Design a binder for this molecule. Structure first.
Ligand SMILES: [Ca+2]
Ligand SMILES: [Ca+2]
Ligand SMILES: [Ca+2]
Ligand SMILES: [Ca+2]
Ligand SMILES: [Ca+2]
Ligand SMILES: [Ca+2]
Ligand SMILES: [Ca+2]
Ligand SMILES: [Ca+2]
Ligand code: NA
Ligand code: NA
Lengths: 353, 353
């Protein structure tokens, strides 16, 4: 009578060597397929160990998601070059995710936790329908990502169908919501076929012009407004966000949401964002250190800061050179006006404008 | 001008094969040392893959914590049996952590995130001193773990020294706090040399009897009150918590703190705990599904429940057989009285009392 153990990695291989002979069979077996497009084995042990690690991370995810019908596979850039061509794999050592007719080029953290969460999100339907109070409140409480909501007659509306096609284009990174309920639309202030776009951390939405909107009109609008003035660094999308610099730099704010000072600082950052939302030259990345435990020592060393306290700085993406605002924790945090004044001082001696 | 990359696992081996010839040198090099006491390689590939995974997890942690002077090593139960004896390694395939004169037998999740967070906590001083407002408020806001606070004259008080020795015994699992400030003591209602013990999720503390307290008096008291009526499953300690069953079963509640319904349910659970805090036969484990993304599919399948909603049930630790309370999400959540009545109904047909 020992007592059952928690689940454990079982050491059984599940990741598929995807090749010319089996790739069609593989796609037929799984509704969602995650493929690592990678390079051939190098001579050096370091590279071999790096690959060994990545493959095992995939093995763990494959074990967790086996019952859900998610498949995992490897496409070698040498041995499987022709497979890569048919599927459109190009980015070296990168994960591509396939669902029905959509291909996703994953640009997030290579960890089992993050990958499993992402793939569970991929499995969900692309549009969330709002019918009840719980669901409406859930929609209203989303602030840390862009979100869209439309009001349509019902699921058979050509305009709802266009909205759903657009949703699939950005799935699962940007949540699309719909309602068919005139009462809900009333609370959201939506006319029929109207789509409201909510920038991350903004209270007021922008309505997509020229309704009813075609799928292309929605997709164009979202692409144009893809970068929020304030955006959160999230494991699922961290590389895409960081690679999207503003002329070689990022304004970076560290704030632990769960901490009193972190929360207050975030509220200040949201104010700064709101007051500058129309300036296309401004993007601030909010990093909550609690989301990236393995990077905190690196950040503290590299930036010479204490991540137990809120920070704001400017980072050069070429060499990670940076400058950080002095804040005395014995005083109140700087107001939005003080933050903006500091950013102006620092950025006045920089690249442009 | 590509742009610097985020840090990555470099594939360089850092985990030490600890043996009879080097073990004394290893302990001298590091202030904190984490040793995996493990079995010799089996013949089957499955076992070999399991070990391969564990070792690489240690490699990742070793890379992250290299600058902090944390060392990682392997002690083979066959090749290194004599080393295991000198150090007191006994638990098969288990991690032991060494700091100065303390040995910790890790009983938490074997993941790099969790291990690094734990070891960063190990590195910190065992007693947190409360001098200012921020620190006092931080102390007051802790609810999900047991905490102790004492008021002493200064660091040279023999009674403070006893408190610190006791703190080292439970470090870093149970936070010990001290103040030397009479004003702070006044707000906390502490007399000189008085130590207040706060059970997790309880508002009212219990004062350790018979002050001033010896180190042994404090340690005895903490051990006697080690199990809180409501306790949170945490990655760092999950196996210790789960293995501490109440006569073969656990009452388990799933609640996502960040969700409206989850938060409300947690508030109800806290009420249930408070109303039954004196009953030594009652322990409820609160699991926030958000803390264990890799186990959610397993739990949903095994227990036949939807973890997007609050749940409460009784689980048999032998075979994971279970029963879960029906709650209709279109109605309000059950009151504390309803929850208690349900638990009584289910547990009346069980093992004892
Ligand atoms: Ca292949
Ligand atoms: Ca409107
Ligand atoms: Ca139109
Ligand atoms: Ca904006
Ligand atoms: Ca060894
Ligand atoms: Ca008191
Ligand atoms: Ca005494
Ligand atoms: Ca109690
Ligand atoms: Na999403
Ligand atoms: Na702790």
């Amino acid at each position: 009578e020992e007592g059952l153990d928690f689940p454990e990695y079982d050491g059984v291989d599940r990741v598929i060597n995807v090749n010319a002979k089996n790739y069609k069979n593989v796609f037929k077996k799984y509704e969602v397929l995650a493929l690592l497009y990678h390079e051939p084995p190098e001579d050096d042990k370091a590279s071999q160990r790096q690959f060994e690690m990545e493959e095992l991370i995939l093995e763990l995810a494959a074990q967790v998601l086996e019952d859900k019908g998610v498949g995992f596979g490897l496409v070698d850039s040498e041995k499987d070059a022709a497979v890569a061509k048919k599927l459109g794999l190009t980015e070296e050592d990168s994960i591509y995710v396939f669902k029905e007719d959509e291909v996703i080029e994953y640009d997030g953290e290579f960890s089992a936790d993050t990958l499993v969460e992402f793939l569970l999100d991929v499995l969900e339907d692309p549009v969330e329908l709002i019918e009840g109070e719980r669901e409406l409140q859930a929609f209203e409480n989303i602030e840390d990502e862009i979100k869209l909501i439309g009001y349509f007659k019902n699921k058979d509306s050509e305009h709802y169908k266009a909205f759903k096609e657009a949703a699939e284009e950005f799935h699962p990174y940007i949540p699309f919501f719909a309602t068919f309920d005139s009462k809900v639309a009333k609370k959201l202030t939506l006319k029929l076929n109207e789509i409201d776009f909510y920038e991350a951390f903004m209270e007021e939405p922008v309505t997509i012009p020229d309704k009813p909107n075609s799928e292309e009109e929605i997709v164009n609008f979202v692409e144009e407004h893809r970068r929020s003035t304030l955006r959160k660094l999230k494991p699922e999308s961290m590389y895409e966000t960081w690679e999207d610099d503003m002329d070689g730099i990022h304004i970076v704010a560290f704030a632990e949401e769960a901490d009193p000072d972190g929360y207050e600082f975030l509220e200040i950052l949201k104010s700064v964002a709101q007051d500058n939302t129309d300036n296309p030259d401004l993007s601030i990345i909010w990093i909550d250190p609690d989301d990236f435990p393995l990077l905190v020592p690196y950040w503290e060393k590299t930036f010479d800061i204490d991540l137990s306290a809120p920070q704001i700085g400017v980072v050069n993406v070429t060499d990670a050179d940076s400058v950080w605002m002095e804040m005395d924790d014995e005083e109140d945090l700087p107001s939005a006006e003080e933050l903006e004044d500091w950013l102006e001082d620092v950025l006045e001696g920089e690249i442009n404008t």
